[PDB]
Amino acid sequence: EAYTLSTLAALPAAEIVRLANSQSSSGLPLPKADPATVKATDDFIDSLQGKAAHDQKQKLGDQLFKKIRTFGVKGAPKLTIHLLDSEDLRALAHLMNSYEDVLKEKVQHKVAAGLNK
């Protein structure tokens, strides 16, 4: 099992990140993450713990929405909401900040199902 980008993006964010962090990343189509970026992402998500769910998703959504807009994909608010409601917030944030290519491919899966309409 060599994942393609597309089959990898079909997994939940938490599992993509688990695979990325496993020593056994034998051939995964992911770049090596920048540790300072990873720490900044985890500190940001740490700062959301304890807040109302809407506020956590608004705060991550602000950044995720901007990221999806840079992909050139229409319907970015609806895609952002769907991702915030279907993915682990921390892992989703790591896709956003460290694994942009698999995030765009995950977004393409969503566009193919009409979830941006």
Partner: peptide, 9 residues
């Protein structure tokens, strides 16, 4: 406020 989440640009 954050009822759905709101992203303006």
């Amino acid at each position: 406020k954050l009822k759905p989440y709101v992203f303006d640009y």
